[PDB]
Each structure stands twice: as structure tokens, then as C-alpha cells.
């Protein structure tokens, strides 16, 4: 359960990303692929090397889904429902992996937004990514 303070904190930190949204999304994916190599096997049709146009493009998509969740934070199950079906039904993404990407997203934010990544905001962002993950893993059948 996200508190009012959490929602404010996430919106604010995300606010500072600006044009960099897709870039940071791509960076998070790259961090995940390098640190947790098991996650690479979901993308056999991507070249995952640094500077990859495919990873850059996908980063923007991931960022967009996260901003969708921020913008509709009180109705996330509905907002992410299609994405939830995709990751469970079609892609069969192991639920452990959401924790890995969530961590790499936090690391990317900490590396780019030092003033914003306070302990309180760190907690808020972690709860938010856990909520997003909970929704994205809610449709296994």
C-alpha cells in the first residue's frame, strides 16, 4: 500500500528524470543484463551489448510503462493489466526477475539523482516498484 507521501515522493523523483526517461530505462536494463545474466535469455532477438539500439528502444518502452503507473498510481492493476497479461501469459517471465529489474532501476536512479535519492524517497521508490511488480506478476494461470 502506497501512502500519500510515497506517491508524492515517487512523482517528484520521477519528475527530475525528464528527457532522460528512456535513457535511464535502457541503463537499468543494461545493469540487469550484466549483473544478473539469467535475465538475458528473455531477449534472444536483441543484441544486448552497450549502445544497442534495441536496448535503447526497449528502455523507452519500460520507462513509459513506469510513467503510466506513476500517473495512475491509484489504479495500477487496471493501468498495467495488458502489460501484466503479456509478461505472464506470453513471455512467462519468472517472478523473481521483477525484483532484479526493480533493484537495477533503483540503482540507476541513485546514480543519476543524488539529491532526490534520500532514504525516505528510496523507500517510496522501492514500494512503488514492488507494487508495479506485484501487478505484473498477478496474472499467472
Amino acid at each position: 500500500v502506497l501512502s500519500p507521501a510515497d506517491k508524492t515522493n515517487v512523482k517528484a523523483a520521477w519528475g527530475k528524470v525528464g528527457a532522460h526517461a528512456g535513457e535511464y530505462g535502457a541503463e537499468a536494463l543494461e545493469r540487469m543484463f550484466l549483473s544478473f545474466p539469467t535475465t538475458k535469455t528473455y531477449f534472444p532477438h536483441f543484441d544486448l551489448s552497450h549502445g544497442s539500439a534495441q536496448v535503447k528502444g526497449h528502455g523507452k518502452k519500460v520507462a513509459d510503462a513506469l510513467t503510466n503507473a506513476v500517473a495512475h498510481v491509484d489504479d495500477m492493476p487496471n493501468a498495467l493489466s495488458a502489460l501484466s497479461d503479456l509478461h505472464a501469459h506470453k513471455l512467462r517471465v519468472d517472478p523473481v526477475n521483477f525484483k532484479l529489474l526493480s533493484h537495477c532501476l533503483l540503482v540507476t536512479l541513485a546514480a543519476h539523482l543524488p539529491a532526490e535519492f534520500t532514504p525516505a524517497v528510496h523507500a517510496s521508490l522501492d514500494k512503488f516498484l514492488a507494487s508495479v511488480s506485484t501487478v505484473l506478476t498477478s496474472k499467472y494461470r
Binding site: A110, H122, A123, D126
Partner: protein
């Protein structure tokens, strides 16, 4: 855990720049703030009622410094983390009964702290080497469970 020479180089170079009086306390405090069930083990540590209280708590800083001290020792003995962490394993597993998932969580919080402090210098390959290290330490600290 197997770091390549380039990863050992990445790890030791960054570590030399770490403030050992501060970073451990920052990680432990953040653990207590971000994952509040962990406060269960620190009842005697005093005021943990707000994030500021936690981060400013002198006991949190002191024990954080002990944690970082154990990481520093782990870095010096990457090929024998198990022996290095044997007594700490008895402590955290046999005495305290801390679930070993929390060792993974503190490792990752430490990673976030290093990213926060070093910014762009904490590159994705540098992070990857540090993940190998914090997984190694978590696994060693959990040996008494295995």
C-alpha cells in the same frame, strides 16, 4: 564467487575511495528504513521512529561501521568468504535467526548506496562486479543455514 581481474580491479579501486566511517551506517540505516521488519532485530538501538531518527542514530552508525568492516574483510579474502564469515554466520543464523533473504537485501542496499555516492563512476560493469561480491558475502553469511 569468481571475479575476473577486471572486476577485482573495478571493485578494489572504488572501495579505496569509500568512507568507512559513513557508508556502512548509511546502508544499515537505509535497510531499516526501506525494509522495516528488519527493525525487529534492533530493539535495543533506541529511536528508529522516523527516517531521520534512524539515519542519525549513533548505534545505527556504529554497527553500520562494523558491517562495512566485515565487507572490507570479505574483499580481502574473496577465495575464502566461508571461513572469513564463519563466526558471523553462527551469530546471524544460529543466535539471531535472521532470515538469509535479508543478507541479500542489505547487500543490494549497499549497492544502491555506492551508486548514490559514486554516481556515473558506478558504471554497469562496476555494479556487476559488486553484485558478485554482495552475493558472495550473503551466501557465506548464510552457510550455517545450508
Amino acid at each position: 564467487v569468481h571475479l575476473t581481474p577486471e572486476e577485482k580491479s573495478a571493485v578494489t579501486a572504488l572501495w579505496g575511495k569509500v568512507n568507512v566511517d559513513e557508508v556502512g551506517g548509511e546502508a544499515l540505516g537505509r535497510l531499516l528504513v526501506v525494509y522495516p521488519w528488519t527493525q525487529r532485530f534492533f530493539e535495543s538501538f533506541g529511536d528508529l521512529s522516523t527516517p531521520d531518527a534512524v539515519m542519525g542514530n549513533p548505534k545505527v552508525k556504529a554497527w553500520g561501521k562494523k558491517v562495512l568492516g566485515a565487507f572490507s574483510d570479505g574483499l580481502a579474502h574473496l577465495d575464502n568468504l566461508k571461513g572469513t564469515f564463519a563466526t558471523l554466520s553462527e551469530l546471524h543464523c544460529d543466535k539471531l535467526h535472521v532470515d538469509p533473504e535479508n543478507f541479500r537485501l542489505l547487500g543490494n542496499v549497499l549497492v544502491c548506496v555506492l551508486a548514490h555516492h559514486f554516481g556515473k563512476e558506478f558504471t554497469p560493469p562496476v555494479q556487476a562486479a559488486y553484485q558478485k561480491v554482495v552475493a558472495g558475502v550473503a551466501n557465506a553469511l548464510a552457510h550455517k543455514y545450508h
